[PDB]
Structure 1
Amino acid sequence: SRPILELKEKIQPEILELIKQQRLNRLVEGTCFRKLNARRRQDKFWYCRLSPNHKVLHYGDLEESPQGEVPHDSLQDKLPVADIKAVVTGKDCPHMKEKGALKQNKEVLELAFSILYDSNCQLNFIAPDKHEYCIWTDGLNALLGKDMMSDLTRNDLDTLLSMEIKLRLLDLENIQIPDAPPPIPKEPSNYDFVYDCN
């Protein structure tokens, strides 16, 4: 399947674009997010919902909603991404480097992603576990026009692209697919259409 897989890896355009557009929808649909360091009568559930125009995020401090997201103008309605530097992941969090009382748990190391902006303040989010943490990192890196970094992304990528090739081998079956480039035998020079066009 060497020429087959070469074809598969040569044609990126559609597959990853549409994946990122579903990811845009995933950011739009929103969910119940997590805050930092809520112990003394502080809330733990809120929302950061994308615009259907896919430019701005509505977010802030919200309430205990068992159903989920509350559609309205929240506390902090702006998050401009015409100027975002990046979103550091891993141990690069200025909030996870607390040395006093706001130190973070070690087991939650896989919820680390910080949307750094203003170069001095931080909006630091927490996920439940690995998979949707990688989902929001997909969304974040998609806001940059760059590559995706999710286990789910590799899984979907492989099954999708393999399926697409699988859905392309239909007209060739019962017949082998040559790998050597077939020649280009000579052609007439004039555009004389003996048969009428259209």
Structure 2
Amino acid sequence: SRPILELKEKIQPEILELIKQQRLNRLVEGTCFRKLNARRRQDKFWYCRLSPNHKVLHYGDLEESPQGEVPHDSLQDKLPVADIKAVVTGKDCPHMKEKGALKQNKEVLELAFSILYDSNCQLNFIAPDKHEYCIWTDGLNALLGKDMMSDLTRNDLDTLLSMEIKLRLLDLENIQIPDAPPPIPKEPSNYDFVYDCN
């Protein structure tokens, strides 16, 4: 399966772009995200909707909405995607290093993601669980045009690439791929096709 494996991993890009468009679709549909220490009458649920243009984010302190995203002008309908330095994950989020009233506890170590913008403004947000945290980070990194950091993303990569090549080798049933590629027979220098082209 060495030619098989090299062929499978060598035609990578389609699944990669496929997955990342799926990611950005998920970002656009989004959901109500989570704030910091939204306890004393603070709406911990609030939607962060990416534009279908995928350039502006529709977000802010919306109500405790179980339904999730609601289509309207959010509190802030812009996140400048052209100047997001990065999103810090984990202890790199300064809001975790807060030791006063905004002390995030040790059960949100994997839900910390602060969008860097304005070179001083951040968006320290929380995720309901790890899977969509990684999902959103993947989608943003796609907006960054970079690698994906969801374990589920690698899962999809592997399963779909394996399926795809699996459904390719039906033509080679009862045939073997020579590890050394077959020699290219000499092509006569003349291209005077005796038969008509097309």
Partners of 1:12 and 1:79 lie apart in 2 by 31
User: 1-side partners of 2:69 and 2:146: how far apart?
Assistant: 29
Alpha-carbon distance in structure 1 between the residues aligned to 2:104 and 2:188: 75
Determine helix, strand or coil for the equivalent of 1:27.
Answer: helix
Q: How far off is 1:191 after superposition?
A: 1.2
How far off is 1:133 after superposition?
Answer: 0.8
Q: How much has 1:179 moved relative to structure 2?
A: 0.8
**SS of match in other structure, 1:46:** strand
Measure, in 2, the Cα distance between the counterparts of 1:184 and 1:31: 55
Report the Cα distance in structure 2 between the residues aligned to 1:27 and 1:5, rounded to whole angstroms. 32
Structure 1 contact 111–128 (Cα < 8 Å) conserved: yes
**Whole-Å separation in 1 of the counterparts to 2:175 and 2:163:** 20
Residue of structure 2 equivalent to 1:86: 86
1:68, CA displacement in angstroms? 2.2
Q: Which deviates further from its counterpart, 155-164 or 6-15?
A: 6-15
Q: Deviation at 1:86?
A: 1.1
RMSD between superposed Cα atoms in Å: 1.1
- Cα deviation, residue 172, structure 1: 0.7
Distance apart, 1:146 and its partner CA: 1.2
Q: 1:186 & 1:175 partners in 2: Cα distance?
A: 24
Is residue 94–residue 122 contact of structure 1 (8 Å, CA) maintained in 2?
Answer: no
Q: How many residues align?
A: 198
Is this contact kept in 1: 2:113–2:123, CA < 8 A? no
Deviation at 1:66, TM superposition (A): 2.8
How far does the alpha carbon of each residue in 1:9-46 deviate from its partner, in whole angstroms, 9 at most, with x for none?
A: 11122110111111111011121211111222221110
Separation (CA, whole Å) in 2 of partners of 1:177 and 1:76: 57
Give secondary structure in 1 for the equivalent of 2:91: coil
Q: Is the 8 A contact 2:32 2:68 kept in 1?
A: yes
Partners in 2 of 1:140 and 1:26 — Cα distance? 11
Structure scoring higher RCO (CA < 8 A, sep ≥ 6) equals: 2
TM (norm. structure 1) is: 0.96
For residues 35-94 of structure 1, what are the alpha-carbon distances to aligned partners after superposition, in whole Å with 9 as ceiling and x for unaligned? Answer: 111222221110100111111101111112232222111111110111111111121001
* Unaligned ranges ≥5, structure 1: none
Instruction: Assess if the C-alpha contact under 8 Å between 1:127 and 1:133 holds in 2.
Output: yes
What SS does the corresponding residue of 2:122 show, helix, strand or coil?
A: strand
Compare 175-184 and 46-55 and name the one that shifted more: 175-184
Asked whether the equivalents of residues 89 and 113 of structure 1 are also in contact (C-alpha less than 8 Å), the reply is yes
Q: In 2, Cα distance between the equivalents of 1:173 and 1:22?
A: 33
Residue 168 of structure 2 aligns with which residue?
A: 168
8 Å contact 2:35–2:126 — kept in the other structure? Answer: yes
CA contact (8 A) 2:46 2:69 kept: yes
Percent identical across equivalent pairs? 100
Please report the TM-score for the alignment, with normalisation by the length of structure 2.
Answer: 0.96
